Design a protein around this ligand. Structure first.
Ligand SMILES: [Zn+2]
Ligand SMILES: [Zn+2]
Ligand SMILES: [Zn+2]
Ligand SMILES: [Zn+2]
Lengths: 744, 98, 282, 97, 78
C-alpha cells in the first residue's frame, strides 16, 4: 500500500538491477515487471527515517559507469570493426537510457530536480543543496557517462575510422550510410541535454577535423584536376564534385554543417583558383560558349569576388558588339538600320542573360551600361547623331510612304523603339527634332491615323513623364480642336445677320504659339491676294468675339490652296502654295509682267520671291521673256501658251524633304539654349532648397536631377554658375571661394 | 483495450478508462510506453497492485473530469475530495504525477 | 560568569574553558573553523564569534542546552548547514545576527526556529528573506539592510514587530496590474488534494505522506481569500505599507513613503478579479 | 452531457453518453470492451431494470445528477449458460479509513 | 477675273496679346518657378512680365530695373 515505510536496499535493488540490466541492453521484459519496478523505485525514493534517493542515485550511476566501461572494453577488444560495434552498442544504450528516464521518472522529477536548486528559489534546503559532482537526470546521465567513458577514450580512434570511410566514399567506394550517420550524429545526440551549444561537442570532435580533412583532400583534387585538364571540363568536374559533396554532406553529417562543408569545398577548388577562371572567362563570353558561361556563373556566384570581373567583361563584350553592329550601316537607311541593330543586340544579350546567367540583375545593369555607351556613340569632333536617327525613324514609321503596312505592326515596332529610346542620354535633342517633324506631319497630313500619335504621345509620356511631351500634347490638342473651330466657323457663316459668300472652300488650322516648333519669317510683309482678305477679316472677328484678349498671326509659308484651269484646252488641277497662288493671280492680269510688278503686287521680299519663281520654272508652268540664264531684277515673265503634264491632278508645292543641315544647327542651338535655362532653373531650385551648399554638392545635385533628359557638360554647369552669380541671386562666400550663399 | 486502458488496483477491481484520459498523468504514460513492441492485441492491463481501489476510482473519475473540463470557458467546479480519502489520493497523485 | 577573547594569544589553543562562565565572546581572531571543544560546554547562553575567518558552521550542536543568543556577524559564512537547522537549537534560541557575512540565501528550515525574538542579517547578499518567515511569530527585531531584497515573501504580513531596518535594497516596482500567470485549469489534482488536505487540517507527517510532498505542504502558499494553494497560483508583487507589520519603520531618502514589495499569491483566476476590483476602488 | 460508471462484478467501465443517447449504444460499448455479444446483458439502475428501446433521458440521468466529476452507477449482468442472467452482485469500493 | 481659286487650307497661330527680364523666358511661356495660374501683368512702363516673377521681384525691390522707376500694375491679362 501507498505509505512511507522502511525498505531494505538490497532486496528491492536486486530486482531493480535485473530490470535495469534488461532495459539498458534491450532484451525481453514483462510489462507487469515494469509496473512493479515503478512501485519499487517510488518506495525507495521516499521512506522513513532513511530515504534511499541518494543511495539509489549513486548505485545506478555506478552501474551505468560499469556498463559503459564494459561496452568500451568490448569494443576496444575488437579492432577494424570499431564503427559497426560502437554504433550497435550506441543505439542499444541510447534507447536504454530513454527507457531509464521513463522508468526513473519519479527519481528525475521529484528527487534530482529538487536538489539542483542554486539560488534562493523559494526552496532552499530540503535536499542536497551542497552540490559537488552535480546531480543529473538519469536519461541525461547515461549519455553523459557514455561520452565520458565510451566516446572520449575512443575519440582519436573513431575519427581515423570515420575519416577513412567518408574519404573512401569520395574515392568511388560505397560505405554503408546507416552506421556512419549513426556514429556521426551520436556526438550531437549525446549532448542533447545541454542547454548551451548542443553541437559544441560535435563541432570539436567531428566537424573541425572533418573540415580540415575535406580542405586537404579537395586541395589535392583541385591540383590534380588543374594538372590534368583545361578550363572547361575543369568547371564541369568541379560542379560534379560539389554536387556529389552536397549529396554526401546530407548523407552523413548533421544538417547544421551542411553549409560549412561546402564552404570549405568550393573555396578550395574555386576561390583558390579564381585567378585561373577569371583569366579565361574573357575568352569564354567572347565566343559561343553557353554551357561554359553557365558553369562560370555557377562557380563564381558562390565566391565573393567571382562576379564583378565577369560582369565587367560582359559589359565590354556587349559594348564592343554594339559598336561593331552600328558602325557598318548603309547610307540609304540610317534610322531603321540603327534601331533594328540596337534591338537585335539588346534581344540577343537579354536572351543570353535570361537563358545562361539566370537573369542576374548585375548582368542586366552591365547590358544597360554597354548599350547606353553604344547608343550615345559619337564620332570624334562631332555631336551625337542618335536622337536625329530616332526622330527620323519615328517619322518614317509614321509616314504614308510605307504602303500596305497596317497599324498593329506599327504598334509592335513603335513599342520596340522605346527600348532604344530609353538609352538616349540627350533626350531633349530627340524631343525637339520629333516635335518639328511631327509638326510637319500634322501640317502636311502625312500620318497613318491619329491613334498612332495617341500611341506616340502616350508612350513618350510613360517613358519620360508628362512634362516631357506636354507641349507636343498641347500641339496635339490644337489638331483635336481645329476642325471643331472650322465647323464652328461654318456655324458663324450661318449665324451672321448679313450672309456673305467667301468664294473659297476655306479650311484653317488653329495652332497655339510657343508650344509649336514653327518659326515665323521676320517681316515678310507679304501682300494677301485680294480674295482672301474677306476670309481673314471674318475669321479675325470670329476669333475676337469668341476669344478675348488674344491675337492671331497668319503664317504664309505653309498655307496652300487649289487652282483649276478649265477655260483653256488643258483642264488642270494644281495644288499651289500661297505665294505661288498670289504670283499666278498677278500673272493672270497681264500677259507680260515684270519683276518690279511682282514686288508691287506681292510685296514679299526678293529671296523668297525668286525661290518661288525658280520652283515655278522647275516644272515649266510659265515662260521667261528674257534670254538671260539668270533671274535678275529686269526679268519679265509670261504665262505658258503650250503647257502639259502627265499627272493631270498635279501639285506645284515643293514636297516636304528632310531638314536641311542649317536647320539642324539652329535646332541644336535652341536645344543648347534650353539646356542652359534648365540648368539655371535646377541650380536656383537647389539653392532654394539649401541656401548653403558646397560647389561639388551643386554639381552632383544638378547632374542627378538633369540626367533624366540630357547629360550636361560640367563646363556648361560652370557657365550657368557665373550666369546666376552675375544675376545677383547668390553670392560667393567671403570665407570660402568655393562656397555660395543666399542674399537675394 | 488498445483504446480503453484498464487499471487493476490492489483489490483486483478493473477500472477501464479512456486512454486519452489515462495519459493525463505522465507516470501512466511512461507505464504504457515502457518495454515497447506491444502486440497491440487490445489488452492494456496496468497492475497498480500497491494502491487501493477506492482511490483508483477517484483517480479515474478525476481523469474524466480533467479531460472533459479542459480548454473550456464554462464555470468549472471544484473536484470533490472526501476528508477520509484526501491523503490516499495525494500520495497517489504523487505516484501518478497528476 | 563572563569572559571575552580579543586576540590570538588570549585564546587557549589546547586547554578548555571553565564552567563558571555564562556568556562567551570571541572577537577578532583567526579561527578558520569553529572548534569542536567549544561545542562541548554546558551553560552557554550568549555565544559570540564576531569578526573571524569561519567558512562552514558545525554540522550538529554537540552538547549545548541553552544557546539563547548566538551571534556570528562579520564572518565568512556562505550557507547554513541543513543538518544544523534540525537540531534542538530551535527550542531555546532567542537571537541570531549574521551581519557583514557572505551569506547569500537563508535555508527555509529556519522557519522551524520559532523561538527567535531578534534577527539580524545586515550587509548580506540575501536574495530574499525566507518564505515561511510567518512561522517566526515571536520575532520582534529584523534587519537586512544593504541587501538585495527585490520582494519580501508572502507571509511577511503575519509578523508584528517594533522596528524594521531595511533601507538600502533594490525594491522592485509594484506590478499589481501585470500578473505572472502560472495557474493551470483544470487544477491538476495534487494542487486539489493538496488544497484539500490543508483545508481539512488533516494532521499529516513524513511517516504518512512521502517526504517530498511533506516539504511542499509545509510551506504551501496562502491566498488572500483564505484558502491554500500549493501550486497553480497568480503572483503579484504588490506594495504594502510596512507600519502595519512593525510599529516603527526606517527608510532612506523617503519622507512619507514606507511602501514595500510583497509577493501576494492567488489561488484561482476568478479570485484575482476580486483583488483587482478592491485595488481599483482603493 | 452525462458520464456513466458501469459496475460489473470486479470491473468498472467509464463511458460518455448524452441524454438522447440510446441504451443500445451503451450495450455496444460494453460489447466492444468485453468482446461479448450485446443482447446478453441488461443495464440496471438501483435494481430498476432498463430496456433497450427507451433512452437515458427518461431514466433520470440528468446533467445535475450524473456529472463527469461523479458519474452515476449503472449495473450490468451478463448471460449464463442458456437464458439465465446473474443478479446484481456489485462489489462495493473498499472502505477508506 | 474669270480664273478663281476653289480651295485654301490656311494655317494660323494664336497666342496671348517677348523675353522676360527676370526669369529670362518668353512672356507667353511658363516661368521658372511655375502652375496654370501664371498670368501676365502689364505695367505703366509698357512692360509685360510674368505674374510670379514680378510678384517675387516686388517683395524686396519696388522699382522696374528696365527704367529704374517704381512699378505700377496697369492691368492683368490671364
Ligand atoms: Zn483565493
Ligand atoms: Zn509662374
Ligand atoms: Zn519699366
Ligand atoms: Zn518671368
Amino acid at each position: 500500500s501507498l505509505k512511507p515505510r522502511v525498505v531494505d536496499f538490497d532486496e528491492t535493488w536486486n530486482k531493480l538491477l535485473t530490470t535495469i540490466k534488461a532495459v539498458v541492453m534491450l532484451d525481453y521484459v514483462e510489462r507487469a515487471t515494469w509496473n512493479d519496478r515503478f512501485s519499487d523505485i517510488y518506495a525507495l525514493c521516499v521512506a522513513y527515517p532513511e530515504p534511499l534517493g541518494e543511495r539509489l542515485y549513486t548505485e545506478t550511476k555506478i552501474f551505468l559507469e560499469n556498463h559503459v566501461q564494459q561496452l568500451h572494453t568490448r569494443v576496444l577488444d575488437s579492432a577494424e570493426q570499431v564503427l559497426v560495434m560502437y554504433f550497435r552498442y550506441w543505439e542499444e544504450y541510447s534507447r536504454g537510457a530513454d527507457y531509464m528516464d521513463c522508468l526513473y521518472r519519479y527519481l528525475n522529477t521529484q528527487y534530482i530536480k529538487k536538489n539542483k536548486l542554486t539560488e534562493a528559489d523559494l526552496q532552499y534546503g530540503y535536499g542536497g543543496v551542497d552540490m559537488n559532482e552535480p546531480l543529473m537526470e538519469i536519461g541525461e546521465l547515461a549519455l553523459d557517462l557514455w561520452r565520458k567513458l565510451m566516446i572520449e577514450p575512443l575519440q582519436d580512434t573513431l575519427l581515423i575510422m570515420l575519416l577513412r570511410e567518408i574519404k573512401r566514399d569520395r574515392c568511388g567506394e560505397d560505405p554503408n550510410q546507416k552506421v556512419i550517420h549513426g556514429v556521426i550524429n551520436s556526438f550531437v545526440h549525446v549532448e542533447q541535454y545541454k542547454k548551451k551549444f548542443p553541437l559544441k561537442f560535435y563541432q570539436e570532435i567531428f566537424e573541425s577535423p572533418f573540415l580540415a580533412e575535406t580542405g586537404e583532400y579537395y586541395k589535392q583534387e583541385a591540383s590534380n584536376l588543374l594538372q590534368e585538364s583545361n578550363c572547361s571540363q575543369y568547371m564541369e568536374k568541379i560542379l560534379g564534385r560539389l554536387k556529389d559533396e552536397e549529396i554526401r554532406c546530407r548523407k552523413y553529417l548533421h544538417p547544421s554543417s551542411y553549409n560549412k562543408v561546402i564552404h570549405e569545398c568550393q573555396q578550395r577548388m574555386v576561390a583558390d583558383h579564381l585567378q585561373f577562371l577569371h583569366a579565361e572567362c574573357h575568352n569564354i563570353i567572347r565566343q559561343e560558349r553557353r554551357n561554359d558561361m553557365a558553369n562560370m556563373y555557377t562557380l563564381l556566384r558562390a565566391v565573393s569576388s567571382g562576379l564583378p570581373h565577369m560582369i565587367q567583361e560582359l559589359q565590354n563584350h556587349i559594348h564592343d558588339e554594339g559598336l561593331r553592329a552600328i558602325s557598318n550601316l548603309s547610307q540609304e537607311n540610317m534610322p531603321t538600320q540603327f534601331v533594328e541593330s540596337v534591338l537585335e543586340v539588346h534581344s540577343k544579350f537579354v536572351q543570353l542573360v535570361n537563358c545562361v546567367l539566370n537573369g542576374d540583375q548585375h548582368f542586366m545593369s552591365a547590358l544597360d551600361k554597354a548599350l547606353t555607351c553604344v547608343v550615345n556613340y559619337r564620332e570624334p569632333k562631332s555631336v551625337c547623331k542618335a536622337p536625329e536617327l530616332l526622330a527620323k525613324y519615328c517619322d518614317n514609321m509614321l509616314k504614308k510612304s510605307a504602303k500596305g503596312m497596317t497599324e498593329n505592326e506599327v504598334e509592335d515596332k513603335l513599342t520596340s523603339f522605346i527600348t532604344v529610346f530609353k538609352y538616349i542620354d540627350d533626350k531633349d535633342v530627340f524631343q525637339k527634332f520629333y516635335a518639328r517633324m511631327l509638326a510637319k506631319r500634322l501640317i502636311h497630313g502625312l500620318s497613318m491615323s491619329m491613334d498612332s500619335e495617341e500611341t506616340m504621345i502616350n508612350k513618350l509620356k510613360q517613358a519620360c513623364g508628362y512634362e516631357f511631351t506636354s507641349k507636343l500634347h498641347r500641339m496635339y490638342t490644337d489638331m483635336s480642336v481645329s476642325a471643331d473651330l472650322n465647323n464652328k466657323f461654318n456655324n458663324f457663316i450661318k449665324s451672321q445677320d448679313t450672309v456673305i459668300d467667301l468664294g473659297i472652300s476655306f479650311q484653317i488650322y488653329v495652332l497655339q504659339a510657343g508650344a509649336w516648333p514653327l518659326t515665323q519669317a521676320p517681316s515678310s510683309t507679304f501682300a494677301i491676294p485680294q480674295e482672301l482678305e474677306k476670309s481673314v477679316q471674318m475669321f479675325e472677328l470670329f476669333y475676337n468675339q469668341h476669344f478675348s484678349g488674344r491675337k492671331l498671326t497668319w503664317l504664309h509659308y505653309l498655307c496652300t490652296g487649289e487652282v483649276k484651269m478649265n477655260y483653256l484646252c488643258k483642264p488642270y488641277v494644281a495644288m499651289v502654295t500661297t505665294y505661288q497662288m498670289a504670283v499666278l493671280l498677278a500673272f493672270n492680269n497681264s500677259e507680260i509682267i515684270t519683276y518690279k510688278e511682282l514686288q508691287d503686287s506681292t510685296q514679299m521680299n526678293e529671296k523668297e520671291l525668286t525661290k518661288t519663281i525658280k520652283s515655278l520654272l522647275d516644272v515649266k508652268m510659265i515662260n521667261h521673256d528674257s534670254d538671260k540664264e539668270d533671274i535678275e531684277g529686269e526679268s519679265t515673265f509670261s504665262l505658258n501658251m503650250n503647257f502639259s503634264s502627265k499627272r493631270t491632278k498635279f501639285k506645284i508645292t515643293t514636297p516636304m524633304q528632310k531638314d536641311t543641315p542649317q536647320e539642324v544647327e539652329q535646332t541644336r542651338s535652341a536645344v543648347d539654349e534650353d539646356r542652359k535655362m534648365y540648368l539655371q532653373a535646377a541650380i536656383v531650385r537647389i539653392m532654394k532648397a539649401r541656401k548653403v551648399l558646397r560647389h561639388n554638392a551643386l554639381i552632383q545635385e544638378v547632374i542627378s536631377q538633369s540626367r533624366a533628359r540630357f547629360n550636361p557638360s560640367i563646363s556648361m554647369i560652370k557657365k550657368c554658375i557665373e550666369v546666376l552669380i552675375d544675376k545677383q541671386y547668390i553670392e560667393r562666400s567671403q570665407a570660402s571661394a568655393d562656397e555660395y550663399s543666399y542674399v537675394a | 483495450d488498445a483504446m480503453y486502458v484498464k487499471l487493476i488496483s490492489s483489490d483486483g477491481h478493473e477500472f477501464i478508462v479512456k486512454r486519452e484520459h489515462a495519459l493525463t498523468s505522465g507516470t501512466i504514460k511512461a507505464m504504457l510506453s515502457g518495454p515497447g513492441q506491444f502486440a497491440e492485441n487490445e489488452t492494456n492491463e496496468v497492475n497498480f497492485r500497491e494502491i487501493p481501489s477506492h482511490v483508483l476510482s477517484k483517480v479515474c473519475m478525476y481523469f474524466t473530469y480533467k479531460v472533459r473540463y479542459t480548454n473550456s470557458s464554462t464555470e468549472i467546479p471544484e473536484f470533490p475530495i472526501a476528508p477520509e480519502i484526501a491523503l490516499e489520493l495525494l500520495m497517489a497523485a504523487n505516484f501518478l504525477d497528476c | 560568569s563572563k569572559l571575552f577573547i580579543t586576540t590570538k594569544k588570549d585564546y587557549p589553543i589546547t586547554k578548555s574553558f571553565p564552567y563558571s562562565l555564562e556568556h562567551l565572546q570571541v572577537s577578532y581572531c583567526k579561527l578558520a573553523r569553529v572548534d569542536m571543544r567549544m561545542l562541548c560546554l554546558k551553560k552557554l547562553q550568549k555565544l559570540d564569534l564576531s569578526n573571524n575567518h569561519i567558512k562552514k558552521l558545525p554540522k550538529t550542536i554537540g552538547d549545548l542546552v541553552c544557546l539563547q543568543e548566538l551571534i556570528l556577524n562579520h564572518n565568512f559564512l556562505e550557507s547554513f548547514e541543513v543538518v544544523l537547522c534540525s537540531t534542538t537549537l530551535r527550542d531555546t534560541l532567542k537571537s541570531l545576527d549574521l551581519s557583514a557575512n557572505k551569506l547569500k540565501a537563508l535555508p527555509v528550515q529556519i522557519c522551524n526556529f520559532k523561538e527567535l525574538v531578534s534577527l539580524k542579517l545586515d550587509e548580506n547578499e540575501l536574495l530574499q528573506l525566507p518564505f515561511p518567515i510567518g512561522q517566526l511569530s515571536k520575532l520582534r527585531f529584523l534587519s537586512a539592510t544593504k541587501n538585495n531584497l527585490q520582494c519580501l515573501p508572502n507571509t511577511f504580513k503575519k509578523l508584528t514587530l517594533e522596528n524594521l531596518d531595511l533601507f538600502g535594497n533594490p525594491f522592485m516596482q509594484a506590478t499589481p496590474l501585470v500578473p505572472d500567470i502560472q495557474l493551470k485549469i483544470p487544477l491538476p489534482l495534487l494542487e486539489t488534494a493538496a488544497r484539500a488536505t490543508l483545508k481539512y487540517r488533516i494532521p499529516y507527517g513524513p511517516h504518512l505522506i512521502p517526504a517530498t510532498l511533506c516539504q511542499d505542504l509545509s510551506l504551501a502558499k496562502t491566498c488572500d481569500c483564505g484558502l491554500p494553494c500549493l501550486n497553480s497560483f497568480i503572483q503579484t508583487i504588490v506594495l504594502m505599507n510596512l507600519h502595519q507589520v512593525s510599529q516603527t519603520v526606517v527608510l532612506v531618502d523617503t519622507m512619507g513613503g514606507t511602501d514595500g514589495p510583497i509577493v501576494c499569491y492567488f489561488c484561482s483566476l476568478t479570485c484575482y478579479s476580486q483583488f483587482l476590483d478592491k485595488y481599483l476602488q482603493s | 452531457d452525462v458520464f456513466l460508471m458501469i459496475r460489473h462484478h470486479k470491473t468498472t467501465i467509464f463511458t460518455d453518453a448524452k441524454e438522447n443517447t440510446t441504451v443500445y449504444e451503451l450495450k455496444r460499448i460494453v460489447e466492444g470492451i468485453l468482446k461479448r455479444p450485446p443482447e446478453d446483458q441488461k443495464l440496471y439502475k438501483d435494481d430498476q431494470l432498463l430496456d433497450d428501446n427507451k433512452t437515458l433521458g427518461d431514466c433520470g440521468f440528468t446533467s445535475q445528477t450524473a456529472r463527469p466529476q461523479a458519474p452515476a452507477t449503472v449495473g450490468l449482468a451478463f448471460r449464463s449458460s442458456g437464458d439465465s442472467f446473474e443478479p446484481l452482485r456489485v462489489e462495493p469500493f473498499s472502505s477508506p479509513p | 477675273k474669270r480664273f478663281e481659286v476653289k480651295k485654301w487650307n490656311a494655317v494660323a497661330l494664336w497666342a496671348w496679346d517677348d523675353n522676360c527680364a527676370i526669369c529670362r523666358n518668353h512672356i507667353m511661356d511658363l516661368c521658372i518657378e511655375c502652375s496654370e495660374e501664371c498670368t501676365v501683368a502689364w505695367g505703366v512702363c509698357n512692360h509685360a512680365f510674368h505674374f510670379h516673377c514680378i510678384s517675387r521681384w516686388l517683395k524686396t525691390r519696388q522699382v522696374c530695373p528696365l527704367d529704374n522707376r517704381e512699378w505700377e500694375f496697369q492691368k492683368y491679362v490671364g
